[PDB]
């Protein structure tokens, strides 16, 4: 698949996945400042055979920001493209919502390019 | 959102 | 949580989740069609200690769109909040995109209203 | 075209457009206090020939959300389609980007169904 | 302002606009192709007064894809914000909705950046 | 998109 | 966002 | 859309 392994965005976060035989995707998503209290549960799913012809392979992940230190009452979801050879990259659309918020209007939307070396 | 983890420096 | 059981869109899919004590969602979707080539695994995360004060439970999760029947090389992420009550409901907006075309043009958005009770 | 009047959204809005022969549209769009200070500029264009066979036509318009009474520094665009017949709309989904707050983490989406009729 | 003048993005396409003193934008939007039938009006609006110790200013516009050559029968927005300085830049995200087809999958969402200089 | 499983009657 | 003019009540 | 005027080469 290529998508097992570390990525890291252009602002400084990272994650850490592994992308399973059944399509599971599995990891921790590591925010900017790097510590404890920046790593939270990631899991998502990945096409496990995507088309040869095609550009890339499909995938989506979420991560609830909530770990044992520290609670932001809201959840990610990025949906987006893993492209593989010599500058491999996961291209990304996201959807930031807050729980605790009404919801019409409680949803950020942006985006993410994951590379294999960091910015 | 500014303070919020996903945006944490 | 109130999350765990079965909902319903307003387009005639289902999903059926469990929500885990540590925050995990894992599940089946199935699209309106009904029959066995239209159930797809998701997973994802939810907030497992919301605000007491606050609006909903943040959530979200992936379906990849292949089963062992068929591969639509793509993936949807929903991003969106729980609201418990008479009239509960998971409020959502989504993102699916195709791994096949070039990044830059392959990702729908829209929502999705989840209710407890068929449409 | 059928789109020129007033329209409602589900929150209490209204905006009032005029479609002109050429693509454009112009109006004004009120928030739900409807008082002199709710009431705002907008502009966009519209397809002022539609195919036949479709399902509607498409549309999009801008607010700057800066009166001669305030300014939240922030603009908002709605993408969609209207759709003709007794029950008229004109389905959307919007983008509400601060202008004030680095680019980023700066949008909002979310969506509005508006009738010619009040909720 | 800053805005009034030509913008190029990142995959070869153009726009150049007016921006008036009282927040209204006009142009035309130029696809990659750059020959008259890629030319198509864009109206918009902006903040006209933006906070002096923020990152940007806010602003949006939309394109029918439909000139005197062709229709796409569908429109784009983006919304987004002007950041001035020797790099200046427009940061946007989009939101290209079909007229033609059923609503809730008639939208896709990308985001372009527009700098002084081409890519 | 009008024939992905996502939207099928 | 609560505050801003499109979702005021 | 890979054929839309917005993503034309």
């Given at each position: 698949?290529?998508?097992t392994?570390?990525?890291?965005?252009?602002?400084?976060?990272?994650?850490?996945?592994?992308?399973?035989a059944?399509g599971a995707?599995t990891?921790t998503?590591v925010?900017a400042?790097?510590?404890?209290?920046?790593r939270?549960?990631?899991?998502?799913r990945?096409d496990?055979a995507?088309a040869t012809?095609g550009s890339?392979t499909?995938?989506?992940?979420?991560?609830?920001?909530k770990?044992?230190?520290?609670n932001?009452?809201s959840?990610?979801?990025w949906?987006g493209?893993?492209?593989?050879?010599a500058?491999?990259?996961?291209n990304?659309?996201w959807?930031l919502?807050?729980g605790?918020?009404?919801?019409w209007?409680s949803?950020l939307?942006?985006?993410?390019?994951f590379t294999?070396?960091?910015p | 959102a500014?303070?919020?983890?996903?945006?944490e420096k």
């Open positions: 698949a290529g998508i392994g570390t990525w890291y965005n252009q602002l400084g976060s990272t994650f850490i996945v592994t992308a399973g059944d995707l990891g998503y925010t400042r790097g510590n404890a209290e920046s939270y549960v990631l899991t998502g990945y496990s995507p012809d890339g499909a995938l989506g992940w979420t991560v609830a920001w770990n044992n230190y520290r932001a009452h959840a990610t979801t949906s493209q893993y492209v593989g050879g500058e491999a990259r996961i990304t659309q959807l919502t807050s605790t918020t009404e919801h209007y949803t939307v942006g985006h993410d390019t294999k070396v960091k | 500014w303070s919020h983890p996903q945006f």
